[model samples]
Target: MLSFQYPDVYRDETAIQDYHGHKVCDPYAWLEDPDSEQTKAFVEAQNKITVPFLEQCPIRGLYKERMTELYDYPKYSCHFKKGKRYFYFYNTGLQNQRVLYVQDSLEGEARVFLDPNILSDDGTVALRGYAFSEDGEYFAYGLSASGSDWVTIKFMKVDGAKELPDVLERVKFSCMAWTHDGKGMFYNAYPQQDGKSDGTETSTNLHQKLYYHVLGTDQSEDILCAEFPDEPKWMGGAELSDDGRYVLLSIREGTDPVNRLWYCDLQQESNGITGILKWVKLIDNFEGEYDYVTNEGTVFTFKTNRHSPNYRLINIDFTDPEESKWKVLVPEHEKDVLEWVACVRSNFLVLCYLHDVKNTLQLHDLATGALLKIFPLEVGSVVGYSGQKKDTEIFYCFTSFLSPGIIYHCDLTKEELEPRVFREVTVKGIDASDYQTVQIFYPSKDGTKIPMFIVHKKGIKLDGSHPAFLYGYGGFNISITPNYSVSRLIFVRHMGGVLAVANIRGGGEYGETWHKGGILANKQNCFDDFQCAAEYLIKEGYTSPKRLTINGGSNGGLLVATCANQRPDLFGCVIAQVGVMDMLKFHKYTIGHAWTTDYGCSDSKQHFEWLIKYSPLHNVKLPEADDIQYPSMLLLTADHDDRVVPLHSLKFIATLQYIVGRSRKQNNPLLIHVDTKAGHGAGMPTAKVIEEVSDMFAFIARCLNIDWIP
Candidate 1:
């Protein structure tokens, strides 16, 4: 057996606080300061212990080499038409960033339109958002560095791909939209702070303002379109109407699916966006979400859950903006949840739904809301789509557990509207026939049935000898669907492991009801559902407790950590990436306050009681039974994770090592991988992603004592 010596960490004994008459200790609270010298030393010291252990693994290099080979494949995104030219993103094998390509026709010669890899030497700069002008004369794109939310908006000429002098800074959580006139664009940003704003700071972000920027102008010359001074936590994004007659401002308080909709009629503005435009509140409450679908003159269509929990499409005339004046176009489904609606062919609506976690695509008449066609899809998910209300053709991407991605093109004028294969992605040495995927419904702790997808090599035996990897994300109204992953396939093919994904509660799999069932006071149901999934896997002889690894990131990180804490013997290894550990203080960090909708805030007495009971950092202790030991843990975070902040992982690891690692019965290793030049997993360079996955799988293999099959 492999043995590990953890690094020594100093914990302040006087670090304690009281909440609603309940006293709690926070010995490692000083780690929250990202810039402090002590925190830097702590991170370096911890890495010293973790790096050596990971490097000693015999299969680490083999996994990286095999993963790099499997990842070397041409990937193409759904192609969209702009003006008279078609545009799409393409990656030839293992490029650092996907390059945008432009062509004159569907089968015409394509050329590189923009390459973000040249923006930075190491590809740390990423293209966050981009939009072409109405006439396609100019292109505006947002660039973020080191995976930060803060982006710099820049403009370029589309014809020759010439750079423009216009630049906008301090843009975060923003949306880019162009006006029909092609003169300027609208975006969202925050006022520049005096100190550091580089993705490492944990200060709460507030007072977001929407602005309109004219081409060839400095950021200071941009006009302020809207600002929520009274609601500092509210973030607003602007979307132009299809006819370009008005702009819709969607105001959201937090991560909830609900938002308040407001509109501005551009024709009424005589001065032309000189100052803050007057806004008329359409849906002034956050009771439901209203997503603008399409507009016909004054009448607008939206997909919402106003009174329909599964969501539906409705029309409202701006002239008569009232609840009673609203008309339902597409009513809610009896069981399926309307995931999204897209307008195409000027008169048709493309509706995607989630029925038992699998995506179903359908086409309907926009004017009459009558079902027209149902696109046959397999037990997979729609990964991407590209279309416009005025376009005659549309494209979408489909993928399952065994499939990479297949792009399909459909012509609306066709009588049957048959979808034709546009691009089929294939890995160099992998075959789908060698693997199999199956879905099963399992009972949770409360008898609630949870759906799970299991994938493994064909003809694998149920001898309880295979290693298993189970993943879950049970919050933020996000649905976990079947999609292709190179690392996960590596686990199944090379490690002789089974990959399982649990569609637990607090997700949008079923509908808003499923989401509400695991939020606030009912959040424990999410944990219970996940643990039961592990139990089900073990009971079926797929894997034993000593060979199972539970993995999650972001909100799912919280899920993995809480499960490991609640039932130490149920899992063999824990992989919590950028998780929220201190539930009581999560609201104090950047964008963390907005998560109160699902997590609830500790400022209230009832919420404090609910959080303290299962908070990962607070609950770490020696196992009750001397024979029970905490599972091997590999907590991960990055220097630029402003979303969840690295402090959560740092504080959590320190507490776990200090409390659980010091016990004599604890022989398993506890480690944390603090990555540099990385954030909360979005926009990471291909090299960084490969490195992280390599380290993760190597750690899991070493902890579980699993051998590489090939």
Candidate 2:
């Protein structure tokens, strides 16, 4: 420790950089094409780590003894409105399904609905998840019907209590949307030709289609699919029009950057808009935009900044079809990351951004262009927010990383927000703030600056010794910013370590430019950003490479795999959660074809010319033969992850065991953790989460030789 001359961390005070040598993490440019067997085996070795770790996860009192009698965990959110009363969907710890916590204009909530896993499509699958119709007459829920590939969709009436025939009998629905009138639900399903599930390409096409199911109607005969010739590309965003006029679709594929919106009009009788008639590109540009258009035709707009990766609220007047009509409700400001925006009832815009890891909700009058302040909500998160356009009384969730959700009635009709009522429930005794978060700029290769967030204890030292765990998802222009800290509490913070979140390129942090700087062929920029953050921590006397641990799920997980493979010296350990390991064969897996939208699928040399560079599995060199130091890694995956198949993890683990065997010069443990009951994201219970985090922390400590008193 006295040898300051050969320090493990090297900080660049010029800009407060970390890591030595290169600011960014990159492999030799030549190893990019992962077409060889060597690269494939390298990736498999990395995934092998999770296998042993899963068996040793010690699935015991891992959840830290949470109280179901007190409050429910904030994993899911539900909200439904009927007449003057609102039926809130919340988990009360005991209910595997969400308890329909009811509320009027007053405070205390009453349990109005519960699915309890029974009364499902086949009276089999858990109806634990449900979406109520607009008029509160019926509800649509998903049921797992034994088979691995699909979940049946079902519907039941509220008053009649008639469990209708399987609403979407023969269809495999990914997600569902309900109309405002409450007659039926708008669903998305793959178009099957002869009962044979279309390959990955065809099934994903369903993510873009819009389907409608009529009440008491034949599930097969009355069901109608959107007549659009081209399916909406993006599978994520879906919100029905207030008047049930059109289904606003958000999608992005291939060379296209910004998410495109197409409106599908379902209502016909009154206006000549019926039967999925036509389509219009609502928002078309590289600039990222978010639209929650209420039924009244007013577009509640929250658009990403063209210059930076930030967001602001605006009003769009389609009647004029010009920029002037795109009224800026909240001017873009860079000082605060505490940002948020929600347009309700087609008029009011409620927002909250980064005030550090916690976000502050700010409501604004879109019609009057006035900013109205809401109450300071501490603890619990704003899971989902809903309210009338002109009404001051709005409903929102105030749950936390460790807390189950509670509904709050926020009346903003007057000058200030007067809480009409608040629902209180307790779950586990967890201190959310005992964990701290901060923003720092890391240096990338070629000397570019990258922003990252670190959450941990307040009085930590600046000596490269703490066991720091890092996480990131740098794709689809997604921003890895503040929302909730539940996962962090369970893993990093609760485990007594610093948790870092890299705002790498490819993410929508600085907006269009930020995303543009790190996508597709430029994806290297994303890895470089993460590498820079890890290096920054080391240089600033925070954590050394030995103490630094990295974790990334999905594409970010891909980043973790590639980065670890290239420079094992930068990290002591890594966790690849549902990672895309085989950069060369991603499209060959389930729903993998659609991923070409985010990752440039290497079908030809043009894409490969860029893809081969830093392709995790494809870029591996035989360390046993060439003496490369392999990093200890844990690979996590759910057996039912249809989106990104578990095969990626399976094959990689098998391959790694062959090449990066423990006999090598460096004995980096390779373990795999597979969840038979979970999907893309492992659906482990809160108790399971605690156990997983503890193991992860123990692994990090074991790797770095750090002392954790607890």
Candidate 3:
């Protein structure tokens, strides 16, 4: 058995706060200051212990080798047509970043259009978003440094890839849209801050404004398109109509799916956008989500959940912009959730639905909303797709637990629409036939039947002795769908492990009712559902508490941490990445206020009571008097994780060590890995991902005392 000597941390005994009448001690509050010398030292000391522990593992190097091999496969994204050329992203086996390629035809000779890897020596600069002009003459892309939310918008000539002189900074939480004339574009941005805005600071972002940047002009000369000065928290994005006659602005105050839609008619701007244009409130309330689908002249179609929880398509006229004037194109499904809608072939709609956690594609008539045909899909997800209102052809990608990815091409002009395989991704040594996946509904603490997908080797015995990995993300209304993962497959193929994904509450799997069942006061349902998932795995002879590892990230990280605190005996190891631990103070951080839609703000007494009941940092406690102890834990955070922030993990781990580690009954390792030059797991280089996954798997192996198969 392995042992650990956790580094000593100073806890200020006087640090305390009174929430309403409840007194809470915050001894490790100093760790929230990322720039403080003490915080830096604390991070260094934690890394010193964590790095040595992981590096000393016997199978660490072997896991890395196998992971590299498994990850070395050619990957392709769905190709989309722009003007007369086709654009797609491709990665040739282990490249740091995928390169954008452009071709003349579907099977024509493709050439590199943009390679992000060359922008930075270590691939720290990433292409966050991109948009092309109406005729594809100009290309505008946004690049983020070190995975920050802040992006720098740059322009280039599409003909020769010649760089343009126009550049815009301080762009965050924005969308890029070009006008029909291709003279300029509209994007959202925040006011320039006083100091650095490099994703390290934990200050709240506010006062987002939309601006229009003209070609060959300085950012200072960009016109202020729109701003909500009185509503500092609201952020807005611009989307142009298919004919580019109207600019629609979608405004939101939080992370909830609901938004306010406003539109400006560009055709009325005879003077050519010289000043702030007048906008008409289309959907002025946040009662439901309204996403623009397509429009013809003055009539606009949108997919919304105003009166239908599962979502429906509706049409509205600009002249009579009222609820009574709206017409439902397609009513909501009785069972399945309408996930997304795509317009193609001018008068046809492609609707993707989520039924029982699996994706289904359907073709419908845009005019009458009549169902034409259903595109057959296996037990997988529609990972990516590209289509336009005028395109005669479209491309989509599909993947599942075992399938890496399959790109399909469809001809919309043909009377019989069918998907033909464009490309099939293949790994070198692994055979997908060796694995099997099954979906089962399990009972939660409240008797709620939660769906879970379990995957493992084809012939694994049900003896409750194999290692199991249970992953969950039970918040934010984000559905956890079946997708390909190299590390997960590696765990099952080489480590004799079982993988379980619990489709718990607080997700969009079953639509709004399911999401509302696990948020606000009912948030504890998520933790209970996750814990019961682990118990069900153990009871079903898949694995025991001594070998089960639980993992989650972001909001799911909160799920893992909360579950571990509630039932430490259910899991052998815990992995929480960039989790939100201090519920009472989360809203003070950057963009954390947006999460109040799901996790109610602590400003209210009822919300505070609900949050304190299961907040990870505040709920850390000693194990039961018996031999039961906290699971061997590994908390991961990065230096630039402005989304959830590293301070959550730092404070959480400190509290865990100070409280749980001090108990005699607790002997398992309490460690943390603080990554450098990384943010919230987006745009991370391939090297960093491989190393991080290798480290995580090694930690799990060490805690479970397992050896590499090779």
TM-scores of the models, in the order given: 0.99, 0.77, 0.99
Q: RMSD of each candidate?
A: 1.1, 9.0, 1.1
lDDT (CA) for every model shown?
Answer: 0.91, 0.58, 0.90
Query: Which pairs clash (backbone N, Cα, C closer than 3 Å) in model 3?
Result: none
Per-residue CA lDDT of candidate 1, range 595-659, in tens?
99998999999998888888888888788987899999999999999999999999999988888
Q: What's the count of clashing pairs in each model shown?
A: 0, 50, 0
How far does residue 79 in candidate 1 sit from its true spot (Å)? Answer: 0.5
Candidate 1 deviant stretches above 4 angstroms: 1-4
Worst 10 residues of 1 by lDDT: 1-10
**By descending lDDT, how would the candidates be arranged?**
1, 3, 2
Specify the poorest-scoring 10-residue window by lDDT in model 2: 1-10
Q: What digit string (tens of lDDT, one per residue) describes model 2 on residues 505-595? A: 8876565556678777888888878888888888887788877889888888888988887677788888888788766667755466767
